[PDB]
């Protein structure tokens, strides 16, 4: 496992500004993975059965925010929350790292059950490049570039661990910058505003 910086949310702290790289959720290398540390992580404790919405917005021209939500099952001490199983992540699918260790600390079993994901597909044009042709990378349109909402109903009480990033910045836009490079794009950190609607 590897430590991450988490932003925690609750009923009195429903919003945050997170900073992410333009390609952070979908690098153009390898297996087209997100970069754990180029993205930004949130945590929120939720009650079973009541729908939740997370809304992302950005002012950055060309930027398309994105998000993956997992349920962090069996989490015990909250100080064991801000870890990930590695420096890269698949945008969908479940994560399992039994008896996980990081920097040494013992984190316990990391069990992350996939809940939902989405990315802002408004403004990307008539067709995305073929590198993005994975069905479970949920393309969502609300008619507003730079805005995204996801929803889910917590299947279990407890901690929901989510990553915010961005994907496929518009060619030659501010967000695109110098382009994908080696796959991670520019190191520029762009602000995405996050609002969690806790029931
Ligand atoms: Ca949108
Ligand atoms: Cu990393």
Residue numbers in the entry: 28 to 130, 136 to 231
Describing publication, verbatim:
A copper repressible protein, denoted CorA, was previously identified from a particulate fraction of M. album BG8 cells. In the present work, we show that CorA is non-covalently associated to the M. album BG8 outer membrane and exposed on the cellular surface, contrary to the previously assumed localization to the Gram-negative inner membranes. Furthermore, both endogenously- and recombinantly expressed CorA were purified to homogeneity, and inductively coupled plasma mass spectrometry (ICP-MS) analyses demonstrated that only endogenously expressed CorA binds copper, one atom per molecule. Moreover, our findings substantiate that CorA and its homologous proteins MopE and MEALZv2_1030034 play an active role in the copper handling/uptake, which again is necessary for providing copper to pMMO required for its methane monooxygenase enzymatic activity.
Consistent with the CD spectrum of rec-CorA, the structure contains mainly β-strands forming two β-sheets and random coils and very little helical content. CorA contains two metal ions, which by analogy to MopE* was interpreted as calcium and copper, and the latter confirmed by ICP-MS. The CorA copper-binding site closely resembles the mononuclear binding site present in MopE*, i.e. the copper atom is coordinated by two histidines, one water molecule, and the tryptophan metabolite kynurenine. The geometry is distorted tetrahedral with the copper ion almost at the base of the pyramid formed by residues Kyn62, H64 and H114 and the solvent molecule at the apical position displaying geometrical similarities to Type I (blue copper proteins) and CuB copper centres. The distance of the copper ion and the nitrogen atom of the kynurenine (2.9 Å) is considerably longer than what is usually considered a copper-nitrogen interaction.
